[PDB]
């Protein structure tokens, strides 16, 4: 049955939610859609409620909406934020114009963590293990988060981590410009468009993240795209002939060849005092050639995680059909597909 809804204005926006959600309080608004913290009286959970902005304006917006609902509906793993609820005040496709997504509410992201506690090696072990446990699950559904950063990792009091806020759009050039954390964790091949990327870009992100946890500092705080590439190549060394071939972009490849050849540095001396196993793992993750990076599944079996590794409790995901990504449709067609997904939802 259709629950009853109530209305209220939350910053030039009239929110219409089911009675079960009480005490809505904003936390941030963007080109995506404003988000409110709220208490779901039906479950006793602190929840984040996102009201998508003009979900079915452009063909682009209509697809993004569908994309995000399909993705959130699929994620069902302890280390990934799934969907708790999705709803709309509309009573038919005809009325359907607004979409609200509900998920667990993030108390503190990983940054929040790196600036308070003094992460011990064990903490690093447990935090990175969880990210890799969730990535394995994600990459197995052939889903690429492609935007892993401290701010996209929720961590509770018990240091339990969940991966959220997947890459569902395409950051504007401006977003990625300058001295910004929105680019420091990006693999080089994606940041400079060397070639068509794959799930391996996330492992590079995990690498940058893990280094920051151990040193408490950003690994590659480039002031811009170029500076960051230099910061990266100074550590992992310039690319050899084999990697150069794999770089499709002739411009990008030609640019790299203009740089003086540098050798990969000794990570033991960069991460002074870091657990030798941690050092070794960082070397297998921060490999310039994505084909040779360690995979999430391979990393979970690494000696550094011996303490937490358990082959029987690192589940893969159900097949995720995203054939729609390559499909061209109209706004109304994307809206109905979206609608059906809303009317077919089932809480956990
Ligand atoms: C305390 O701060 C915040 C807490 C949040 N808790 C969970 N998800 C968020 N964002 C988000 C990302 C992707 C999909 C959805 S749908 C529920 C919502 C949040 C945003 C915040 O700040 C802006």
Swiss-Prot record:
Expressed in which tissues: Brain, heart, placenta, pancreas and skeletal muscle. Expressed to a lesser extent in lung, liver and kidney.
Consequence when changing residue 334 to R: Loss of kinase activity
Family recorded in the similarity comment: Belongs to the protein kinase superfamily. CMGC Ser/Thr protein kinase family. MAP kinase subfamily.
Source organism of the structure: Homo sapiens (Human)
Impact after mutating residue 48 to V: In a gastric adenocarcinoma sample; somatic mutation
Protein name: Mitogen-activated protein kinase 14
Activity regulation, short description: Activated by cell stresses such as DNA damage, heat shock, osmotic shock, anisomycin and sodium arsenite, as well as pro-inflammatory stimuli such as bacterial lipopolysaccharide (LPS) and interleukin-1. Activation occurs through dual phosphorylation of Thr-177 and Tyr-179 by either of two dual specificity kinases, MAP2K3/MKK3 or MAP2K6/MKK6, and potentially also MAP2K4/MKK4, as well as by TAB1-mediated autophosphorylation.
Keyword Phosphoprotein listed: yes
């Amino acid at each position: 049955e259709r629950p009853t809804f109530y209305r209220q204005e939350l910053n030039k926006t009239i929110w219409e939610v089911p009675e079960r959600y009480q005490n809505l309080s904003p936390v941030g608004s963007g080109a995506y859609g404003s988000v409110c913290a709220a208490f779901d009286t039906k479950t006793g959970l602190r929840v984040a409620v996102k009201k998508l902005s003009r979900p079915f304006q452009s063909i682009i917006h209509a697809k993004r909406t569908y994309r995000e609902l399909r993705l959130l509906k699929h994620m069902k793993h302890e280390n990934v934020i799934g969907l708790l609820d999705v709803f709309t005040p509309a009573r038919s496709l005809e009325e359907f114009n607004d979409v609200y997504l509900v998920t667990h509410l993030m108390g503190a992201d990983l940054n929040n963590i790196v600036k308070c506690q003094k992460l011990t090696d064990d903490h690093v072990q447990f935090l990175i293990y969880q990210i890799l446990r969730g990535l394995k699950y994600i990459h197995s559904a052939d889903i690429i988060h492609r935007d892993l950063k401290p701010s996209n990792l929720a961590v509770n009091e018990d240091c339990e981590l969940k991966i959220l806020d997947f890459g569902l759009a395409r950051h504007t050039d401006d977003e990625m410009t300058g001295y910004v954390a929105t680019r420091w964790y990006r693999a080089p091949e994606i940041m400079l468009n060397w070639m068509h990327y794959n799930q391996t870009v996330d492992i590079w992100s995990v690498g940058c993240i893990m280094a920051e946890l151990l040193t408490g500092r950003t690994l590659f705080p480039g002031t811009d795209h170029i500076d960051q590439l230099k910061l990266i190549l100074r550590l992992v060394g310039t690319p050899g002939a084999e990697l150069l071939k794999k770089i499709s972009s002739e411009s990008a490849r030609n640019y790299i060849q203009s740089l003086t050849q540098m050798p990969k540095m000794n990570f033991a001396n960069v991460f002074i005092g870091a657990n030798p196993l941690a050092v070794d793992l960082l070397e297998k993750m921060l490999v310039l050639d994505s084909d040779k990076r360690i995979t999430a599944a391979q990393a979970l079996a690494h000696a550094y995680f011996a303490q937490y590794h358990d082959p029987d409790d690192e589940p893969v995901a159900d097949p995720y059909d995203q054939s729609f990504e390559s499909r061209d449709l109209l706004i109304d067609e994307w809206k109905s597909l979206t609608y059906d997904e809303v009317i077919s939802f089932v809480p956990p």
